[PDB]
Structure formats: C-alpha cells, structure tokens
Amino acid sequence: MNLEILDLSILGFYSLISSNSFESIAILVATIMPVITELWYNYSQLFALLYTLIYVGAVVILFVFILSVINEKEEYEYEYSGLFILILVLLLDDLDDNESNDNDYNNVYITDYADWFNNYNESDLSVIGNLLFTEYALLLLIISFILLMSIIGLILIVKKD
Amino acid sequence: STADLYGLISFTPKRDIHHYVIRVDEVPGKHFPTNTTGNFGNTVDFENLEPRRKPINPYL
Amino acid sequence: MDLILLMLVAVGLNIIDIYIMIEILIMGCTVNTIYSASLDNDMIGLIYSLIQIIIAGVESAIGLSILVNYNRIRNSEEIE
Amino acid sequence: FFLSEYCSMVLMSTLTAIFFFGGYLPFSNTIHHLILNLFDQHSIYYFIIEGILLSGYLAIKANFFMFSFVWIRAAAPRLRYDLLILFCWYVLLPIVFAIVVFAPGILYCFDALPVII
Amino acid sequence: ALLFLPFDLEVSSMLPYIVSIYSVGIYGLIIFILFLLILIVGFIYEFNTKSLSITTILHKKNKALVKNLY
Amino acid sequence: SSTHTNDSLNSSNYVDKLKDTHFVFENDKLPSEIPDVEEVGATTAPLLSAAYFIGAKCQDYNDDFMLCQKEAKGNGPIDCLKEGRRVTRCASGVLKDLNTHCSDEFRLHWQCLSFSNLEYKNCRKAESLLNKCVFEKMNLVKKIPGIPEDRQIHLKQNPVLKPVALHQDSEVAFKKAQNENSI
Amino acid sequence: METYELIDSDPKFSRVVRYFRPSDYLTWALGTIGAPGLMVLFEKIEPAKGNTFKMPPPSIMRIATTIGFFGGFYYAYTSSTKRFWGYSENAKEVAKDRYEVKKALSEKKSPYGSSLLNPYQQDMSARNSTNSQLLLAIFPWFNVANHQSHGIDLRKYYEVRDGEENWNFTLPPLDQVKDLDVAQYKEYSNYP
Amino acid sequence: APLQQVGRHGGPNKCFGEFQRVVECMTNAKHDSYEPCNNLKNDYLECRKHKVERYKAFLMQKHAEELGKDPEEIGAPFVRKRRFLTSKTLGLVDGDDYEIGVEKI
Amino acid sequence: AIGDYPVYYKQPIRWLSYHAHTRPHVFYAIAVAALGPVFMMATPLRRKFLYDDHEPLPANGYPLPNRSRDKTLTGYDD
Amino acid sequence: MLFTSLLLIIVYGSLVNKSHLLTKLINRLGLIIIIYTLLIHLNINTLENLSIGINMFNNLLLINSFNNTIIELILIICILYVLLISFNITGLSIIDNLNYSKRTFIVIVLFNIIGLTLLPLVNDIMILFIIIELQSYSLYLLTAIFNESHNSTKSALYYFIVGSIASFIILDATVSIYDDLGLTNIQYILMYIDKLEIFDLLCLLFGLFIKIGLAPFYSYSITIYSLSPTIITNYISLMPKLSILTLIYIIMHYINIVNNTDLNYVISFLILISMFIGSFGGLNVIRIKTLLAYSSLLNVSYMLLAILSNSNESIIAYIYYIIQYSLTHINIFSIILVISIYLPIMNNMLNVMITKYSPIEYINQLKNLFINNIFIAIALCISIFSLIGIPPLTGFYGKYLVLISGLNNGYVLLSIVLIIASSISTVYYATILKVLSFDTLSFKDIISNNLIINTSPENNNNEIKPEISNVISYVISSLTLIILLIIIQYENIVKGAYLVLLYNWV
C-alpha cells in the first residue's frame, strides 16, 4: 500500500474546505512534507534536504506576515460547500492519476548496469559544485546579481525612509 | 535594377529538418572535470577530428 | 477533473493564498526536473533544479515585500 | 514542549563537542590504549568497554557544555530580542562571512585544500 | 525578516563549494570570492541605509523653549 | 555516495517499495562457445589488501585489457572477453600465492581492514609485515605511481593520522618480528 | 569586410594591456575626464537647480571620474582586443606577437605559459572567456589564465617572414616545448 | 561546446556517447543534409527512455498471453523483498532460507 | 576639531582609527576578510621558498598507457 | 560597463546625504553610464562581424547581427528615458520633484537594462529562465518605486502575480523540453528539432505572450499602465516589448524549421483576437493612458504578424517597425509629461481628483493645446497621425512593411483584419486630435490666467523666459521631425535593414 496516496487525498480534501489564511500556510507545509519524503525515498536525498533547509525558512517568514495582516474577515464568515459535493469531486479526481499516456513507459520496468570505471567516487553535490563553479560560473554570478537586486528591492519597497 | 535587387534580398530559401543552421563549433566531451574515461562509450577521436562545418559569412 | 479547472476551487480567498499556489506550481517544475535528472544520471538537470529553487525563493521575497508595503499603506494614519 | 527544549540543549551541547572538541576521540591516546589493552579483542567485552570509553569521551565533553548552558543562565541577565537581531546581523554575520573567505585562502596558500578520505 | 530570505539563499548557495573545494581549485575559489563580493555590496547597502533597525512609531525630540520678547 | 540508482541495492526497502523493485536472476550460463574461467572469489577486505600486488603482477594484462576497451569503440564487453579472462586468472594467481606463501601475514592485514573501516592508514603495521613477506617470496613491491619513492605514504615514518583503536593481533605480530628479525 | 591576420582568438588580460597603443592610453584619459566633463556640459546645457550655472559638488566629480576611468579602460581594452581578433589593423601587433612567441619557443617555453589549471580547467576557462569582450559593455569578464585555446597554429611561427631574419631564433620541434599539449601526455593518454 | 549528460561522478554518463556521436555527425562538413544523423538521434533518445525496447517487451508479453504460455515459466525469477535474498536463492552450497542482514552494513 | 570625522583621502590613517574605535564590528570583520586574498597572493612565495605544489590526484579514470597494444603478450590463455 | 558602474552607483547613493539635487545629479551619472555603455558596445560589435553568430560564456549566450541591433536600440531608448529623470520635464517643483525623490530609481533602471539586453542573447534553457526573472523582478521593483502611492503599489502587486504565473509557464515549458531530450543548450536542442514536441515551445511562447500583454492576457497590462505614474508607465509599457519580442522572433525562427502549421494557427488566433480587442477596446475610454494601453496592444499585434510570418521580409519589417514605434512612444509620453503645465486650476460636479503622479489622466485635459502651444500640439498631431499610419510618416512604412511580410506568407485574413483594425482604431486616434484643436476658433479670444504655468514667477520683466526647458524641448523637436521627414532617408534606412541577418547567409 502506497501511503503517499492517502496523504495527498487528505491534503486535497483540506485544500477544498480551507477558509482562513492560516489554513493556507498549512497547506503549503502539508505539501512540502510529502515532496521531501518522496524525494528522500525515491529519487534524490540531496534535494530532499535542500528543500527542508530553504523552504522552512521561507515558511516561517510567510507565517510571520500572516500575523501582521490577519484582518478578522474569514473567522465569522460562512461557507456552504456540501460534504457530498466535496467527496464526489475528490472521487472523480482520484480516477485519473496517469500524467503520461505512454503505457509501455509506465508499465515496463528497466534496469541499469553498473561499471567500475568511476574509481574517483564522490557525492552528487561535489559534481554539481564542480560544474556550477567552473563551467556554469556565469549562471552562479548572475544568481548572485539577482540576490543583490532583491536586497535593494526589498529596502526600496518596505522602508518608509 | 531596384526591382532585381529586391528580388534577391527578399527571397527566403526553404528550411526543413534536413538543412538549417546550427551554431556549434566543436564536439563536446574532450575533457570532463573528473573521470573523463567513463564506460569507454565516447567513440569520438579528438586526435583525428574531421573538419567541422564552418559558418558562412556573406560579407567576406 | 483538471480541464474543468478544479484547481481554481483549491486556491484560497486571500492574496497570500495566491502566493502559495505560485510556490506550489513552481515546485512542481523542480520535482519534474529532479525526477528526470536522476533517471538520466545527469547533473546538469540537478544544477537546473538548484537554480530553480534559489530563483523561486527570490520572487517569494520580492512578492512578500510588495504585499507588506500594500498593508502598510492601508494602516497609514498612525496617529500614535 | 519541555522535553523537546531540553533535548535540544543536549543536542547542541553534543554538537559543540563534535564540531570543536573531536567528538568521541579520547582526551589521551596513551591512556585510551592502556585501558583497552586489558581486554582481549577476541572477546565481546572489549567492544563493550570501547563503546563505554568512546561515548564517555563524548559524554564528558557534552556534560561540560550542558554545564555551560546552566552556567550562563546563573551568571548573565537577559538581553532584549531587538538587540539580539542587531547583534546577530551587525556583528556575528560580518565576522563569520569573513572567516568563510579567510579559511579557503589560507589553505590554498599552503596547498592544503581538503579531500575526503 | 524579508532580508533574511536573500541571505539565506546566499548561505545555501555555498553548499556546492563546500564539498568541491579541492576539485574546482583556484578557479572555483576565485569564483567563490566573486559570489561573495557581489553579495557584500548588499551588506554595505544595508549598513549605510540602516535598514536593519527597529521601526518605531514614536520619536522623542527635544523642543527648545524660546521667548519672543518685545 | 549514497545516491539511489537503478544498478545496485539502494538504501532501504522503502526505496524498493516506491520503485517496485524486482531483484532479477538469470539461470542461464555464458554460451558454450565462450571459454570458461573461474571467477575471483575474494571479498572486499582481501581484495583491498591484495590490490597493490595484483597491480604489480598483472600490470601488463591490466593495461592490455583496458587498452582493448578503448580500441573497442563502444563494442567493449564483447571484444575484450579474451583479454578479460587473462586478467581474472592473473589476479587469482596472486591470491593463490598469498594463501600459500604469506597466508598468516595476508590474513592478518585484511582482518585489520575489516576491524578498521577498510582504511589503509589504520593498518600500517600488518601491511608492513605483509609487504616484507610478499617481497621475499614473490618479489613484488608496492609502488604508488606519480610520486618519488621516498614520499610514498605507506612508508611514512611519523604519519599525522593514526588509528584511534589498535588491532591487538597486529601489535603482537609487529613486536614478534621486531625482536627476532631486526636484532 | 576588411579582415586582417588573427593573432589570438582569446588574448590574455596582460597581453591586451601591454599591447595598448599611445592612442589607447589617450582614449583612456579621454574617458576618465569625459565623465566629469559631461557633468559640466549637462549643467551648461541645462542647470540642475534654477536657471543659473552651478558647478557640481566635488563628491559628484569624484565618483564621475571613477566611472569615466573604468569606462575609459573598457573602451581601450576593446580597441586593443580587435587587433588580436583581426577585426582592426594590427600590422604592428603581429610583428610584436611573432617576436615574443619565437623568443619563447627558442627557450623551449610555452608561448602561452605554465598554468595552475589542469587540462579540464584550461579548456573550461577558454570556453568561458573566449569572445567575452563582445559583452564588455554589459558586464566584465577577462582572460586571466594561461590556456592553450587561442585559435592559432604554432606552426605558422616556424616560417620566417619579411623583416625577421635578424632575429636568428632557432626553433625546436613542438614536442620539446615545455607545458604544451603536444609534449605533455607522454606515459598516459588521459594524464598530462 | 558545453558539457551535457554528466554522470553523478563527474564523467560522461550512460547516454553521453550517443549524444557525442550526434553532435559529431551534425557538425561534420562532409554531410550535405542531416539525413545521415537521423539514426543517431533515435539511438540517443532510446538510451534515455528505452521506449522502443519497452514496446518490444509489451509485444512479447502480449504474444505470450494469446498462446497460453505461463508468465512464470518463460520469464526470469525474481525476489521482491531484499531481506529474502537468501543463500538458498543465491545457490550457495550451505544455503539457507533465513533472512539476510540489511539493517547496518 | 577635537573629535571631527576624518576625511579619508586627506587623513587615511586617522580615518582608519575613527572606524576602529567607533565601529569595531565593521573594521575588524573587514580586516579578517582581507587576510583571505592576501594569503592567496602570497602563494607564489611559498612555491619558491617552502615547498612545491603536490602532484595532481589520478581522478580522471584509469590511467591508460599512451602506446599501442602489445601484440606479443601471452600467458593465462584458455 | 553597466555591471561595474551599477555597483559604484549603488554604494555611492547610500553614502552621500539625501537631497533632491544629489539624486538628480546621480541620475545624470546614470546617463553617462549608458552613453559609455553604448560607445563601448559600438566600438566592439559590428553588423558585418556578427552576421555568422558568435557564442559566448560556454555557449550560454549567442549574439548575432539581429540581436545586436536590438541591443543598441534598447540602449538608445534608455538614454532618451533617462533624460526625463535627469533634466526638468516641466520646470515646476510641485511636478518635477517626484522624479528626484527616489534615489534607487536610476539603480533599478540600470538593473533592468542589463536584463533587457541579455534576454535576446539567451542560448540555454537554464539561462533563459534566469534572465527572464532578472528582467521581470526589476520591472516589479520599478512599478513599486513609489511605495507611498496606493495605486503604484497595487499595480506592482498585480504585476508580480501575473508575471510570476507567466514565468512558471515559461519554466514549465523548459522543464518539459529537458525531460524530453535531456539537453539544455538551444543549439543542442536544435539538433532534435524534429523529435521534441513543438507545442512544448508554444507553452514557452504563451508565457512570453503574457509578459507583452497580448490578448486574452491583455487585461492586466491595461489596468497596470493606467494606474501607474506617467513616468513609470512610459518605461514599463515599452521596454519589456523590445527584448521579449526580439526573443519571440528568435524562437519563432527555430520553430519554422519544422513547419508546424497547427502552431501557426494558434498564434494567428491570438493575433486576430488582439486586433479586435485593441481596436474596439479603445473606442469607449476617457483616460489617455488607458487609450495608449490599447494602442500598445494593437501595435504589438501588428509586429507579431511580422514575427509569425518569419521570413526575409519579416526581418526588415520587424526591425524598422520596432525602431519607429519606440520613437513614437517616447515622443508621445514626453509631450504628455510636458503639457501638464497648461492645466486649469480651480479657485464642483463629478468630483474629479487629479494626483501629482499623473497630472494628465483624461483625454479632455488636452483641450485647447492648439491655443496654449501650437508647436507642441502639431508635434502631438504628427505622432498620432503616425500611429494612424498617415503617409509619408514613419508609421505608414511600418504598416506597409508589415503587410508585405504578412501577405507574402499567405496570411490573407490577418492582413485584411489589421487594415480593418487600423480603420476602427482611427476613431479613437482622431478623438485625441479633435480634443487638441477642433475648438480653436470658438475659444481663441478667452482669458486663461488660471493655468498651472501661470503660477510660475517672472525674473525681471525685461528678459525672455522660455516656457519649456531646453533638453525636453529639443528631444520633442528632434523626434517629431524624424517622424515627419523620414521620406528623405527612407531608402537608405531600409537598405541598412537589408543587411541585418538572422542565419540567412545564402
């Protein structure tokens, strides 16, 4: 039983019924956690950890803004929905989870063959840094330039002075 | 002459999947940061590389 | 269910809820990049994934500051 | 919440011992060999003692920093958080980013760039 | 709090260099410094603008008592 | 490196569940037209212990097998089967000679590697005895190419990095040779 | 197109500055004083405040001189680069280039110089820096490495041209010149 | 020519050689048109997705069903749980069906 | 003029002292950071007076001998 | 030069004290920086050398003679725009002090110019995404430079949200292509142009269409341009189009290799709708900037027909059209900024509220311009007639060259529809001229001492005091006469556009 399917089923239910802004900042965290875990267990543990290191800091800053802008509006308001229309919507959605229509690509299993030629064996992050700091160093230096612009941009927007 | 000159300049030769301009001057993979000799699947010989397709400069 | 734009009901009714949708939508692009790069054993895709994460975090900050100053403008009397 | 806060104190005390005091490495290599030479390595009792010894070195260093957590609480008054923000952003960040440039420059000058082995 | 995000990304951008410092050699080290030197202009900018202060809403100013004599 | 791949065992069985991994066997032997060869039966610790003696004995055959791979131009695993069989036999010859000539010295060294995370720096004493025994009986010298003979790390008198835990058998066997051979 | 002889498809930073003509230094000075001078001209064209002329403050003239100083060097750097590329007349630079290369070859030294970079990094550095002067107006990037990807064949330095007989350089074969690719991979084909 | 398809250890990966032979063909000056390099393009795309090879396996599985062949009699034996890669399955002389240790290497 | 603010291009030494007394968090962070590139500039001195750079690691795969295959090699045949 | 001088200006601006004069002088330093950038770029980049196409920075960028011309055009128009913030537009402090109150105004412009010039050069999907973010972020920061303005901040919020959705669409398109091919460099992807899904590139174009305000995504740009200050609206309504349209042309140049007519039909559908909305949309509007927003949507539809046809005649059409439309755009906004000095002052029905950011907000605030300043009114008439396409103004040859490329490629419907669209949009172009002049005689002998210009003092009553400042007057004079008298040099200018090649060669 792939229990990640159940997790996304609950998350989709709570995204349809979410009312206030605090629930939305919880839908975000309830989305990154399935992403981080599935990356950890299937494809990339490096990027599972990079997601946690960067998105959490963004989440708390996002949460602190909710405190300064919460404006009483959706606590006392009413929503109608209907339990039957919610579950029927989620049932129809769950029916079609085939993002791709290449049946052979989705059904036939493949393998790779290992070789011993790579005797200098290092992590993916060392190769990523090796290329990023040598061949795509321009991409890194532009990213540094964009980060500098954000620093100036945030000040010229928020600072009253 | 003016009519003839415009006919030459404004003619657009046909492009298809068999003839078009690709701006790549050399074959990649002569050097890698590490482990340049991998599975020995790199069958391109850089010692005896055939001449590449040099781009045409119409003003030369 | 996607073609009838069911995602328009899943987005909350605050401006910040639109920000979260944008982050989730961009995060879908990065997960697709990581998945393809890992299958191909290609580090260029993972470099792309790292760039997307950093850039997506930049616009999150720039958009937040605009929303922060927008709220300050409403609370402008500040007689205190 | 109380349990997790004191778990974090033990974790950060143990990380202080790991990042700067060698983790589980013995204080004295001579004494470490003397104690372990009493037990036959072909018996399971050697590995019990070694596990106690190595964790003891980690325990001693972490106990001192858990002591230091209590020690600073009993000696220093509280600092306002708005002063903490200025302290971290105007003092600590410039110093740490100086060392992140200082350290690779020293190592390159003496041809001692680190590798994993 | 907003400026935390640009600096957090800058710190997370040094992770590729940490585990590849030897391989990139002097070329990567110089690029690493250039990455940090461009971001140090943001640090100079924040210091000179005093953007990392506390936004009080009250200000205590000392008025001078003066006499319009005749 | 602990990256998940599709070519070997992954980190845990949750990785297998997500990938629906099938661990597949093939009961067919190699085709009868290809000559047979007995595979090398040594595990990780004995092979690492014997790595520099296989290099000093099979250098011509190792290079010839690798040079065949380069000249194969993609048709590698097929066109170098004959060269590969020479490499396997030569490596087995070294392991055979170790177990008949330097058996106690050899088994001492790779039992220390198993005891010491398979790090060469942790087992210098047993390695020195094995190097001395192999050189006398097989005339094989461990050499690290690209550096002067007197800057080889395994011959360093006062290494900076030393094992925290001492292998008791290596300490005993090192003392015995000290008092009996270097009088 | 009035093309000329290609000297170096990616000239090193030191070579570009050394090969500055006296006019290149003249334009460097013009850029340096052209920025404060334009601030005076703009004030003369239309005063910043009111209707009367006012000299801009010294702090503005200080930062203007710095901006012009960098702008003057970038212009001079691109002026000298065109001669290496063959886009501009470079007869003087060819004679100077041939003397320096033949002198270094006779000493069995690399015309490009020894590098701290391994074969990959020399190749990578040339990929990053070659033709980068076309965007020197947007952001800077210079060749400050001793790589071998300069777009030239060193065999053309082995034919004596007019006005080079008095140099009397005896050139060895290329496989004896230190730190060249054709004299580096002796034992292994993947290690220099 | 920038590097593409770099393996996790810094060298060329499985499909780099296919890509390299495509670039060499497309940029060779001896070719009048790009028709000679069409088979090289399919080979590179087959290296990544194996779509035609998966399609062939689809035909073989389907063709075996219609002739009544048993999937477990014509396929390859497999084990789904890593803990049960036992010495009896591996064929060792003193094999056993007890689970193998996978908790800590 | 007991405690005026020094002008950097007129009194460089006094300008350094002002910031080292009033803004230590700026003066000394820069001073530490300057020691990075300064040591990198002293590297040529080390290569001539203390010891040379090490030989590069064999991190480019198996070292293939730069020669033709030996066609007279025998031994360990089928 | 741009990058190096930006760093000095960033630091220098934060060092000196805050005053309106210092910010104005710092803006003039920005003017010198762009001039030096143009001189350096001209000194090294020439049309004849770049015809082949030269790779830079590990093939991440690719500059050719088609890219180079747009870069110089961007630098030239950016020079003209900085004159607005570097000199007096009106001469009255209540209006002009706005352009000097933000010290980061010039810094953001230099940030955006770097993004504008690099975007047409992108040769990799990774750098395409990075640069399109760099250009977009600077536009958001410029839209919000006046953070004490409620409308300016509201526009920046709308701009950020819509432009982030487009960027995600652009990123999603590149990720799909990388998934298909495993390649990131454009020239490498061109080797597999026949095997990747070509509609993955239409998704890339769709994100670019949002950023140029094409229909059906036109709503946000019409809203943003009307709410933003006139100085901000002048920049953001023109600058993104110079770079993105050039990039769209290069992408469509690669798409035409495989000749997918289904993709050509979807784009033709978007052009057809944009002509209908651009022409009928402006008929019932009262704001001048809302009217110009529809004019921008209409002229983009004309250029996209040349981009869609994508032939030898299309290079000449697009290159000439983009140059002459930028000058007309600059000329009109320069006049609109100037003529705020002729606004009457009260001493009331409909409770009309006018702010300092946009003193000229309604079309009927242009009333009696024929009386207040005949030379400026004629200059505005010449520009509006150029947008109409009255020969022999520059706008006529723009429509003529667009029609040639469109009809040469068999786009019969779009050529007819645009000519109908031109006639429909003439109705609201003429309404500007009706407001300027049609009441001249019935109002010539009236006493108007209640204008904004009358609040200014007089020096000596014996001197001659010009009513408009020197620099802004000379720019309006120069651009208007270029628009009017292009017939003199049209033959030579179009021969130059013949030489601009995009891998034509032979």
Ligand SMILES: CCCCCCCCCCCCCCCCCC(=O)OC[C@H](COP(=O)(O)OCCN)OC(=O)CCCCCCCCCCCCCCCCC
């Ligand atoms: C250690 C476990 C921590 C979580 C345990 C509590 C379980 C509750 C749900 C956790 C997350 C599941 C998905 C929910 C997404 C957010 C939607 C939401 O609004 O929260 C649900 C919660 C229930 O409120 P309820 O009364 O049922 O609905 C409103 C009725 N007008 O309304 C609330 O506002 C309460 C939320 C409390 C704060 C939760 C913060 C999010 C924590 C997520 C961590 C785990 C990540 C998600 C893993 C499951 C994925 C489905």
